[PDB]
Amino acid sequence: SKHELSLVEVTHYTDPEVLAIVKDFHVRGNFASLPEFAERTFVSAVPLAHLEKFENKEVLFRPGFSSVINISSSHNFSRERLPSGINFCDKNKLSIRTIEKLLVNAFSSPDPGSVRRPYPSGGALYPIEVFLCRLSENTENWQAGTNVYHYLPLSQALEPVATCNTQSLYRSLSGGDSERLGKPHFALVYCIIFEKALFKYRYRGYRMALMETGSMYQNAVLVADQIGLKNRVWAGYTDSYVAKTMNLDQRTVAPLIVQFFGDVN
Amino acid sequence: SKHELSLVEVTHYTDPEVLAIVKDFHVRGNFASLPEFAERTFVSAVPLAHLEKFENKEVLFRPGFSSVINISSSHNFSRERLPSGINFCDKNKLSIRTIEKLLVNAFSSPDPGSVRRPYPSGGALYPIEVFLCRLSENTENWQAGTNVYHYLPLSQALEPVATCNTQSLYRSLSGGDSERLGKPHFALVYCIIFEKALFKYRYRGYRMALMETGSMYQNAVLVADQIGLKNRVWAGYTDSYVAKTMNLDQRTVAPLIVQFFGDVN
Amino acid sequence: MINVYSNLMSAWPATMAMSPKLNRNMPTFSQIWDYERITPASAAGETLKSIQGAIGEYFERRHFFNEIVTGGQKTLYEMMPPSAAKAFTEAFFQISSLTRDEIITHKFKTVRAFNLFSLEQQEIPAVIIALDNITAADDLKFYPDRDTCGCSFHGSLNDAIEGSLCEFMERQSLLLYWLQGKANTEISSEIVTGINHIDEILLALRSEGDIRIFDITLPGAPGHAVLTLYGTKNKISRIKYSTGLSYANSLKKALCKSVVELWQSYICLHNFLIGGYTDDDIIDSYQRHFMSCNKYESFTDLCENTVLLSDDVKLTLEENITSDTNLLNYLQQISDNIFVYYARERVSNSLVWYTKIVSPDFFLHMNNSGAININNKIYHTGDGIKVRESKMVPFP
Amino acid sequence: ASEFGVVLSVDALKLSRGSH
Amino acid sequence: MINILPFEIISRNTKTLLITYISSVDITHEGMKKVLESLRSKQGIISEYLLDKLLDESLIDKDKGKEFLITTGVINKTKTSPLWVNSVIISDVPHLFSNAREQWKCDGVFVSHIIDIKDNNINVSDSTLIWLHLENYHSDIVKRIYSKFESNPGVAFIQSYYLKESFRIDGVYSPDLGTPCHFCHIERWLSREEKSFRRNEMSWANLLQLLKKYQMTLPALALGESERGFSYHLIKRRLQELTGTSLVKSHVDNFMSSVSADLITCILCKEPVIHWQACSCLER
Amino acid sequence: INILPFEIISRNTKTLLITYISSVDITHEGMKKVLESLRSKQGIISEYLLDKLLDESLIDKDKGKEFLITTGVINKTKTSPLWVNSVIISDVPHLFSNAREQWKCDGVFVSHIIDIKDNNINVSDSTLIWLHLENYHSDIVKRIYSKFESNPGVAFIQSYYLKESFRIDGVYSPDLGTPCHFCHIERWLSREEKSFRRNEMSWANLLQLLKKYQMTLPALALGESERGFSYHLIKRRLQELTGTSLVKSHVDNFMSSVSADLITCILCKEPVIHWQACSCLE
Amino acid sequence: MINILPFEIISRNTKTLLITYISSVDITHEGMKKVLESLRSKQGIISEYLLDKLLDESLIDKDKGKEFLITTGVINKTKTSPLWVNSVIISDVPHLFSNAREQWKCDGVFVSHIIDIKDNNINVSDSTLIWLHLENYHSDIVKRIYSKFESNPGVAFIQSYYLKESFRIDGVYSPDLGTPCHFCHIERWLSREEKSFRRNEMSWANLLQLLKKYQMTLPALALGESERGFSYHLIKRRLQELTGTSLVKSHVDNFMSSVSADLITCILCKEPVIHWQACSCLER
Ligand SMILES: Cc1cc2nc3c(=O)[nH]c(=O)nc-3n(C[C@H](O)[C@H](O)[C@H](O)COP(=O)(O)O)c2cc1C
Ligand SMILES: Cc1cc2nc3c(=O)[nH]c(=O)nc-3n(C[C@H](O)[C@H](O)[C@H](O)COP(=O)(O)O)c2cc1C
Ligand SMILES: Nc1ncnc2c1ncn2[C@@H]1O[C@H](COP(=O)(O)OP(=O)(O)OP(=O)(O)O)[C@@H](O)[C@H]1O
Ligand SMILES: Nc1ncnc2c1ncn2[C@@H]1O[C@H](COP(=O)(O)OP(=O)(O)O)[C@@H](O)[C@H]1O
Ligand SMILES: [Cl-]
Ligand SMILES: [Mg+2]
Ligand SMILES: [Mg+2]
Ligand SMILES: [Mg+2]
Ligand SMILES: [Zn+2]
Ligand SMILES: [Zn+2]
Ligand SMILES: [Zn+2]
């Protein structure tokens, strides 16, 4: 609002060829993930029974050889990352103060006068937008009836987005795997604004934008661990349906990744 | 070596259509960034003089409106991220112990028996590889003559990669903007193994891999700040030239992003 | 999006773009920038309408500001039938300080027109139509103040006329409202339209500030001229006032275009102001004037001074017995002297059309702070608010 | 202005040609 | 929901063989032979009660019988309530579909009505997938249908039509799910067909054409009985993928995408289309 | 017969016909019935159906037709190719010394290469005149137009240089009523001259000062390679305009310019439209 | 390095005009007129000493003169040492290039030699960009050149040749930089040309062909003088982009990419090609 940018300024530099080729590509990665499609679709090209062989492994630069410089673990001063929460449980009320703690710590400076975020960004352009989705009636709310919000990291404020109910929003974000997921209190959805990702650096901007998304949800992971929230980054959603439900215009902006938050009993 | 995975297992599931379409796309984002091309190429579609208007801004969901739920900064318990270092200075010797501290904290568990990394990953497949590049003769080294290494996050060990000299490796990573960059002690290069990103989830895997890259370099940012290293994530490099110099085979693996580390006088 | 760019030596403008937006329930804005050949054309609403409207406004404005050529040079009584030449003479005799003898003997630059009612072919003075200072340079002493009221572009002659006629109605209605402060009705500020993007705007404006919706249609006239007004006292809002206006047979249609045009003006100015852009960026004095009206006092001045013919506030958008009646019948009852300037150009296997509807029996332009035929068949000096006869309405 | 002539025309776009 | 899968059960002299997509068995049991002939007779779905009845009739244990029928590939058990409860086909060539309702039951597809586009007062219940298939293309036909039915709770649409030497099946158009409509599709193909050497379709020639009322026909080669036959099979299999007996699961990244076929070469191309920038379907 | 775009507007028993070149009071009921009928028929019609329509509306066939042709409701166009031959008029004719020979095998038939500096240029009926200029002056186009506008079935196309661009104009055909050279450039100059705020460093200033000083606009520093590139573009446009009717070919094949950036070698194909103010519309 | 840009300087009666890509000036000074005629005479690069000499000769201040010449678009100052110090053209049609060395100096391109492919003992210095242009394509010709010169310090190659109705210019092949070679290119185009409706080129038909010695010719339409002319201009401009007087800067994401041209339509397509999976150029 003080640091507002109009997308009209941005589009003055858009190469329409670039935008079309990037969106054509991007859309190949969209999913049609719904409870009603479970028995006629699949996600994994690898059978369940062969998967473990591929999980948590190292690819070697000289496969079959073992000559390495070992490094001490005595240098590690970190905590182990918590396991990613699954079937969340919404028995406890969850306050707005807890959602607020996450938002300001993961995405904003401690100094509300400063514009320097806790993650870097190609060209300082920050093309990735954070949306808040409230998924539980046991989640406290700022403005009754409003379940989608947009986080403004520089003003440190929430912008109302949608008054969809809590059941519809859970359905869109939770794809066909909702029963395993259980019941999170809330989610963040990270979205790319295509022209903002593309206008300065062209195709390479798409690459920089997706990486930024990762820097962001990672801060959220670390911050969640510290305030005693469980979380799970989530790709099992129908992209367009999420978009639709949040009243995003898919010609301009698209959800890259969902991240779920809550308790685990 | 204990948690080794052979790419032969992976390729048994590769859709060659998917791999071709993803690489065709990916390569559109590669740069030809060299000192010798400075006066006949450009990077920014936006003139220098109009850029500030686009830097550190907020795009609004309701542009022109100001109605928001403000959030307290009293919830923020974090430190402000350091500015990203520029023209690095290699006057000080930098020890292997410092590079080791960064590596184990950003990418490895504190428990060397555990396989659970401090960043999540689609399918626990971890398709992104970390390479270490030594760029200063004032940087200590584990094996004289070896300036490229591959970090094995689960074994917590370095695998020798290349004995290119330090000048050649700096030239490849620093593109045409080396004079502004100055002299970093070392870099990490984050690389995607295409078939490993693609085999399970197909196109959506590419999206998940680039985001993972961001979660990774972000841990490095936070860890660098804590051990008193400066850093700058960097996209101003010639992709194939870096690849070539590090002896990566570009048919299998490609550099997504470089990250520079060192002091700043 | 769109993002069509033309070389500066092209026939076509520098740029056309459709603006990205996050919110799918907000209207599309589309715009064409062509250096300072004209000021940027734009339109807003449903996506394709937006795009058609910006293209259309661009063709319209380029024609009137940059492309007119006169069909030569005649006195008023040569170029048209007598009772029309008289009507023009009386208008011009108010607008400058030259004598009736000077006016009737002056050879005016001419443009093709036809009578709205009889289709009789004639000419009218080019000085009314051309918005550049060269086309009818030698005529400007008779008519120094020109503008785009009643101007319109379309690919059907019928649409071009209908567009010209509706704008004429809305601007005649606006000036009469401005001068007298009389409106037919207020439509509920809390009206629900049923159309997503219209509702979105109204909700955003209601929560940012306050709106008033007024039917200011020329008395007795069919159709609806709907004027929408916003203002806020909110300190961090950069827009303290905006407004929009449209006329149509249909009350709903007029309200919707009215609301969308308010938003269109709201967001253009908002973007100017946050863009950091300077006064040297403003080349159009209507825009300069509108921009100096960006204060709450523009809103309260209209609202406190608005008298309403009907008691209660319209809760629904249902028509009435007047709306249905014949607009040409109504207009001809007031005046025979309404002309349609027209031009046309082949594009592929179609014609595109540029029209302007003009009457010296009505207000010839909308700047009653310039030289204007203040006395005419719908107003005479004294009927209205006096300070307002020498001040321009706060409308862009 | 210069002592060598008077400028008639200019192609503004051609004459023009990390974070800022 | 017991779905009966493709198989045959063949006998000559005293030898009887079952052959399915999954397996082949030398049947050494009269009762199970009878069961299998009865099932081969039925179209598509069968009440688990009928199956038990047919098993008990041949004196065969019910879970042993069932386990046999499932694992050998004769039947399968499905549990999920589907997105569209029902399909209708709307067409300018309804004769081409006059046995479709009957035949496609055996593929597990419920098509409730074949509707001639000429008909007024066309009605469609909630959560119905509308298949609009046109030989003689006009965009006003699609507009009319969207206009009649976009508001129906849970509706979706598929459009099929011909362009040049191709048969086109659009992605599923679902207001609820936010997916691209017909016009998003046909603009993607009219762009590719321009000898432009450019993905980007936009220019002042296009801008000027957009001023006119959106309206069009499509050039395409004349159809024979053979092109119609080919088309009938892709329609059936596409409907089957979405709402019928799944034989081969689709990946989530392609399940709703367009399917295009060259009628010369018979090669399929499955392809997700982006929203067209100048389209209105997102704003509805 | 091609039916051109036009409008008819009615009020009282009054009717006004407007076409691309005319504005006409229609008082004969017969002709209202003929125009209303043609208004809803889109484009190309047969001589037989037109004649049937006229006879129905009690209008002399010969006279009725003369009206429709003269006011620009119809034109009497060929189902066979519009230009049986072509000629190139140039200030650099030597660049085309082998063009006639060579372009044969591309199916392109150029009868004559002609120096613009020749006095007494003649040109056959049904011929397309390619005017190519390295030294552009609008009076050179004016001269060619004046000489040949009246030749049966004549058309014109003009190629020239503007800074880094090679511009090929649309085809100007009096018979078909397509835009001319001046419909582009004079309109372009009008827009510079009548700008809401004149850019005081406009390229119009150069163009207008070259008139005032009686100087041509030179192509900027052409070498062999730019001429080779030009040569090929010319050959390929002529190929596009060969074997062409209004039955074979859409008007947009004529009502299109080709601009080639000689640096990037990128082409830009743009629509060309009429200018109400142009004198090609009489 | 003072680069002389495209301009003209025209006089009639007492009026003299300078016109460049950047600007136009009414020249009101005899000295600067002389300077400008002299520069219009010279090809391409000029010693800053010659420029100063020419300025002093016309009694013009040197920095005022220079500032004028730069800002008006007559010249510019470039500072950078380029990647290839030198270009050679190797061709089966060297006659087509017999004035190229001379002419292209004015475009700031240094081509040291035109080499007939028929010649033995072909020599190329270090840091030379080798342009191989073939009308009569054979892959053995490319193999021979790579074989002779891949090892040369700082070498790069461009290949140009015809395929169907297209003229092809490959991406810059640079062992040092790791960029795709000719064969990476021609496999990308032979894949696209298959009526496959598939990006993926691999099948058992291809596998079997790979057993034979890699060897091929290309089908392409016959060339006239006009196709040759067009080709000459793209070669010059491509060389100019890489090693000559830059007029228009290229984006870093396309600078080294392939350039393809339809000779029918004259439309360019600039496109980065991936490494071919079965290619050896990465392993060298
Ligand atoms: C980009 C991304 C997408 C993911 N998508 C899903 C998902 O769709 N479903 C799920 O259960 N977990 C998902 N995860 C979580 C991973 O499966 C998890 O990080 C991994 O199995 C390791 O487990 P841990 O995080 O508990 O150590 C995702 C993680 C990432 C980084
Ligand atoms: C993906 C990515 C690529 C970047 N590339 C560059 C680069 O090429 N050159 C550079 O100077 N900085 C680069 N940066 C650093 C940003 O310019 C920097 O984060 C931003 O200007 C904000 O400054 P700060 O990080 O000091 O707050 C990059 C950052 C990211 C996230
Ligand atoms: N007197 C007639 N009686 C019956 N049918 C006729 C008559 N004259 C013409 N036709 C029909 O109308 C069609 C149109 O022919 P028309 O005389 O209009 O030539 P055209 O369409 O002007 O073609 P072109 O001049 O290019 O050869 C003919 O093919 C013919 O079948
Ligand atoms: N489909 C169309 N074809 C041609 N011109 C159009 C079309 N739609 C709108 N226009 C023109 O675009 C211009 C702007 O229209 P609009 O924004 O609706 O109203 P306003 O007159 O308030 O600007 C007008 O000249 C209008 O006639
Ligand atoms: Cl209406
Ligand atoms: Mg408008
Ligand atoms: Mg208007
Ligand atoms: Mg208006
Ligand atoms: Zn659509
Ligand atoms: Zn003309
Ligand atoms: Zn290769």
The alpha-helical segments, DSSP class H, found in E118-219 are 139-149, 182-193, 204-210
Q: What is the rounded distance in angstroms from the CA atom of residue G72 to the CA atom of residue B123?
A: 60
What are residue G115's DSSP bridge partners? Answer: G90
Residue position matching structure tokens 């009219």: E190
Q: Which helix (H) or strand (E) holds G133?
A: strand G128-133
D8·G17 Cβ contact <8 A:
yes
What are residue G157's DSSP bridge partners? Answer: G130, G173
Contact residues, chain D, for G72 at CB < 8 Å? 7
Handedness of CA E231, E233, E239, E241 (dihedral sign): negative
Task: Look up residue G10 and give its amino acid.
Answer: I
Asked if A118 and A107 count as a contact pair (C-beta separation under 8 A), the reply is: yes
Is residue C150 in contact with ligand 4, taking CB distance under 6 Å? no
Distance in Å, alpha carbon of G216 to nearest chain A alpha carbon:
33
Q: What is the rounded distance in angstroms from the CA atom of residue E111 to the CA atom of residue E126?
A: 14
Asked if A37 and A224 count as a contact pair (C-beta separation under 8 A), the reply is: no
Q: What is the rounded distance in angstroms from the CA atom of residue E48 to the CA atom of residue E42?
A: 13
Q: What is the rounded distance in angstroms from the CA atom of residue E18 to the CA atom of residue E121?
A: 49
Asked if E65 and E32 count as a contact pair (C-beta separation under 8 A), the reply is: yes
Query: Could you tell me how far CA B24 lies from the centroid of its own chain?
Result: 21
Residue position matching structure tokens 């960043």: B119
Task: Look up residue C70 and give its amino acid.
Answer: T
Instruction: Select from A169, A176, A170, A173 the least CA-distant residue to A43.
Output: A176
The overall longest dimension of chain E from CA atoms, in Å, is 77
Residue C311's SS3 state is coil
B71·A158 Cβ contact <8 A:
yes
CA angle at F244 for the pair F239 and F247, rounded to the nearest 5°: 150
Residue of A233, A237, A260 best suited for mutating to test ligand 1, as the one with most atoms within 8 Å of CB: A233
C-alpha separations of B31 from B47, B106, B182, E144, G256 in Å: 19, 27, 20, 49, 9
Distance C33 CA to ligand 6 centre (A): 14
Query: What residues contact B23, with CB distance under 8 A and at least 6 apart?
Result: B194, G274
Contact residues, chain A, for C29 at CB < 8 Å? 8
HSE value, Cβ hemisphere, 13 Å, CA-based, for G138 = 8
Number of CB pairs, chain A paired with chain D, less than 8 A apart: 3
Q: What is the rounded distance in angstroms from the CA atom of residue A6 to the CA atom of residue C29?
A: 12
The order of strands in the sheet holding C4-5 is C4-5, C15-18, C28-33, C41-45
Q: What is the rounded distance in angstroms from the CA atom of residue F102 to the CA atom of residue F239?
A: 13
C-alpha separations of E254 from B26, E259, E271 in Å: 21, 10, 7
Query: What residues contact F187, with CB distance under 8 A and at least 6 apart?
Result: C11, C67, F275, F277, F278
Asked if B18 and G202 count as a contact pair (C-beta separation under 8 A), the reply is: no
Asked if F19 and F73 count as a contact pair (C-beta separation under 8 A), the reply is: yes
DSSP string covering chain B, please? --SB--HHHHHTT--HHHHHHHHHHHHHT-----GGGGGGEES-SS-GGGSGGGSS-B--SSTT----EE--GGG--SPPPPPPP-SBB--S-B-HHHHHHHHHHHHS-SSTT----SS--GGG---EEEEEEE--TTB--SSTT--EEEEETTTTEEEEEE---HHHHHHHHTTT-HHHHB--SEEEEEEEEHHHHHTTTTTHHHHHHHHHHHHHHHHHHHHHHHHT-EEEEE--S-HHHHHHHTT--TTTEEEEEEEEEEB--
Instruction: Select from A26, A33, A30 the least CA-distant residue to A236.
Output: A33
Contact residues, chain G, for F231 at CB < 8 Å? 225-226, 229-230
Q: Which helix (H) or strand (E) holds E241?
A: helix E225-243
What are residue A48's DSSP bridge partners? Answer: none
What is the 3-state composition of chain G as percent helix, strand, coil, each rounded to the nearest 5?
35, 25, 45
Q: What is the rounded distance in angstroms from the CA atom of residue G244 to the CA atom of residue G106?
A: 9
Q: Which helix (H) or strand (E) holds A179?
A: helix A178-181
User: In this structure, what are the phi and psi dihedrals at residue G169, rounded to the nearest 5 degrees?
Assistant: -120, 115
Q: What is the rounded distance in angstroms from the CA atom of residue E43 to the CA atom of residue E2?
A: 11
Residue position matching structure tokens 């704003």: E283
Instruction: Select from G265, G88, G83 the least CA-distant residue to G176.
Output: G83
The alpha-helical segments, DSSP class H, found in chain G are 30-41, 48-57, 62-71, 100-103, 139-149, 182-193, 204-210, 225-243
Asked if B207 and B122 count as a contact pair (C-beta separation under 8 A), the reply is: no
DSSP string covering C332-368, please? HHH-S--EEEEEEEEETTEEEEEEEEE-TTS-SSS-T
Ligand nearest to the CA of B212: 1
Q: What is the rounded distance in angstroms from the CA atom of residue B109 to the CA atom of residue C160?
A: 72
Query: What residues contact E170, with CB distance under 8 A and at least 6 apart?
Result: E158, E159, E160, E180, E181, E182, E185, E258, E273
Looking at chain D, the number of H-run helices and the number of E-run strands are 1, 1
Asked if F163 and D11 count as a contact pair (C-beta separation under 8 A), the reply is: yes
Taking CA–CA distances from B6, the nearest residue in chain A reads A59
Q: What is the rounded distance in angstroms from the CA atom of residue C154 to the CA atom of residue C56?
A: 7
Distance C49 CA to ligand 4 centre (A): 8
Task: Please give the sequence-ordered ranges of beta strands (E in DSSP) within chain A, or none if there are none.
Answer: 41-42, 69-70, 128-134, 148-152, 157-162, 186-193, 230-234, 253-262
CB burial class (10 A; 0-12, 13-18, 19+) of residue C308?
A: middle
DSSP string covering G173-224, please? B-TTTT---HHHHHHHHHHHHSS-S-S---SHHHHHHHTSPP-----BPPP-
Query: What residues contact G276, with CB distance under 8 A and at least 6 apart?
Result: G180, G183, G184, G187, G188
Q: What is the rounded distance in angstroms from the CA atom of residue C220 to the CA atom of residue C169?
A: 12
Pairing of strands C151-154, C350-358: antiparallel
Query: What residues contact B165, with CB distance under 8 A and at least 6 apart?
Result: B147
Residues in chain F after which the backbone breaks (C–N beyond 2.5 Å) = none
CB burial class (10 A; 0-12, 13-18, 19+) of residue B112?
A: middle
A247·C20 Cβ contact <8 A:
no
The order of strands in the sheet holding F256-261 is F110-115, F85-90, F127-132, F155-162, F165-168, F256-261, F267-271
Asked if A225 and A79 count as a contact pair (C-beta separation under 8 A), the reply is: yes
What are residue C356's DSSP bridge partners? Answer: C151, C341
Asked if C244 and C213 count as a contact pair (C-beta separation under 8 A), the reply is: no
Long-range contacts of C159-166 (CB under 8 A, 24+ apart): C159/C353, C160/C342, C160/C353, C160/C354, C160/C355, C161/C340, C161/C355, C161/C357, C161/F9, C163/C355, C164/C340, C164/C355, C164/C356, C164/C357, C165/C116, C165/C327, C165/C357, C166/C223, C166/C246, C166/C247, C166/C248
Distance A248 CA to ligand 8 centre (A): 29
Ligand nearest to the CA of G282: 11
The order of strands in the sheet holding G15-20 is D5-10, G23-27, G15-20, G7-12
Q: What is the rounded distance in angstroms from the CA atom of residue G230 to the CA atom of residue G266?
A: 9
B55·D16 Cβ contact <8 A:
no
What are residue C111's DSSP bridge partners? Answer: C124
Is residue C53 in contact with ligand 4, taking CB distance under 6 Å? yes
Instruction: Select from C139, C169, C140 the least CA-distant residue to C152.
Output: C169
Query: What residues contact E101, with CB distance under 8 A and at least 6 apart?
Result: E111, E112, E113, E114
Asked if C88 and C76 count as a contact pair (C-beta separation under 8 A), the reply is: yes
Q: What is the rounded distance in angstroms from the CA atom of residue E137 to the CA atom of residue E142?
A: 9
What are residue G160's DSSP bridge partners? Answer: G133, G169
If you compute the radius of gyration of chain A from its CA atoms, what whole number of angstroms results?
Answer: 20
Q: What is the rounded distance in angstroms from the CA atom of residue A89 to the CA atom of residue A182?
A: 7
Cα pseudo-dihedral F175, F178, F184, F185, rounded to 10: -10
Is residue C56 in contact with ligand 4, taking CB distance under 6 Å? yes
Query: What residues contact E187, with CB distance under 8 A and at least 6 apart?
Result: E201, E276, E278, E279
Q: What is the rounded distance in angstroms from the CA atom of residue A222 to the CA atom of residue B221?
A: 13
Nearest Cα residue to atom 22 of ligand 3 = F47
Tokens of G218: 């290309």
Contact residues, chain F, for D12 at CB < 8 Å? 201
Instruction: Select from B249, B76, B248, B54 the least CA-distant residue to B169.
Output: B248
Task: Look up residue G270 and give its amino acid.
Answer: K
Handedness of CA G24, G25, G31, G33 (dihedral sign): positive
Q: How many CB atoms lie within 10 A of CB G42?
A: 15
Q: How many CB atoms lie within 10 A of CB B101?
A: 22
In the 8-state DSSP scheme, what is residue C182?
E
Instruction: Select from B256, B259, B182 the least CA-distant residue to B217.
Output: B259
Instruction: Select from F180, F174, F181 the least CA-distant residue to F77.
Output: F174
Q: Which helix (H) or strand (E) holds C26?
A: none
CB burial class (10 A; 0-12, 13-18, 19+) of residue G217?
A: exposed
Number of domains, chain A: 1
In the 8-state DSSP scheme, what is residue A137?
T
Task: Look up residue G64 and give its amino acid.
Answer: K
Cα pseudo-dihedral F174, F176, F182, F186, rounded to 10: 130
Q: What is the rounded distance in angstroms from the CA atom of residue E245 to the CA atom of residue G98?
A: 71
Asked if B157 and B148 count as a contact pair (C-beta separation under 8 A), the reply is: no
Best of E174, E188, E252, E256 to disrupt the A interface by mutation (most A CBs within 10 Å)? E252
A1·C17 Cβ contact <8 A:
no
Residue position matching structure tokens 């060990």: B157
Residues composing chain G? 284
Q: What is the rounded distance in angstroms from the CA atom of residue G60 to the CA atom of residue D4?
A: 9
Distance B6 CA to ligand 7 centre (A): 68
The alpha-helical segments, DSSP class H, found in C181-284 are 196-208, 251-275
Q: How many CB atoms lie within 10 A of CB E154?
A: 15
Alpha carbon distance, N-terminus to C-terminus of chain B:
41
Asked if G31 and G12 count as a contact pair (C-beta separation under 8 A), the reply is: no
DSSP string covering E107-137, please? GT--EEEEEETT-SS----TTEEEEEE-SS-
In the 8-state DSSP scheme, what is residue F79?
S
Q: What is the rounded distance in angstroms from the CA atom of residue G34 to the CA atom of residue D6?
A: 17
CB burial class (10 A; 0-12, 13-18, 19+) of residue A141?
A: middle
What are residue E160's DSSP bridge partners? Answer: E133, E169
Q: Which helix (H) or strand (E) holds C100?
A: helix C100-105
Distance C14 CA to ligand 7 centre (A): 21
Residue position matching structure tokens 């699954």: A86
Looking at chain F, the number of H-run helices and the number of E-run strands are 8, 14
Q: Do chains B and C touch (3 or more CB pairs under 8 A)?
A: yes
Chain E CB within 8 Å of residue B203 CB: yes
User: In this structure, what are the phi and psi dihedrals at residue A81, rounded to the nearest 5 degrees?
Assistant: -60, 140
Q: What is the rounded distance in angstroms from the CA atom of residue G177 to the CA atom of residue G194?
A: 31
C-alpha separations of B156 from A58, A62, A63, A68, B112 in Å: 11, 16, 16, 10, 7
Query: Which structural domain, as residue segments, surrounds residue B63?
Result: 1-265
Q: What is the rounded distance in angstroms from the CA atom of residue B206 to the CA atom of residue B125?
A: 12
Residue position matching structure tokens 């492309």: C67
Query: Could you tell me how far CA B53 lies from the centroid of its own chain?
Result: 28
Q: What is the rounded distance in angstroms from the CA atom of residue G193 to the CA atom of residue E260?
A: 19
Q: Which residue in the set G21, G25, G65 is minimally distant from D6, CB to CB?
A: G25
HSE value, Cβ hemisphere, 13 Å, CA-based, for A44 = 13
DSSP string covering A190-218, please? EEEEHHHHHTTTTTHHHHHHHHHHHHHHH
Residue of C31, C38, C46, C55 best suited for mutating to test ligand 4, as the one with most atoms within 8 Å of CB: C55
Tokens of A135: 């998924």
Q: Name the experiment that determined this structure.
A: X-ray
Q: What is the rounded distance in angstroms from the CA atom of residue F127 to the CA atom of residue F88?
A: 10
Residue A18's SS3 state is helix
Asked if E179 and E185 count as a contact pair (C-beta separation under 8 A), the reply is: no
Chain C CB within 8 Å of residue E280 CB: yes
Pairing of strands A253-262, A186-193: antiparallel
Pairing of strands G250-251, B41-42: parallel
Q: Do chains C and G touch (3 or more CB pairs under 8 A)?
A: no
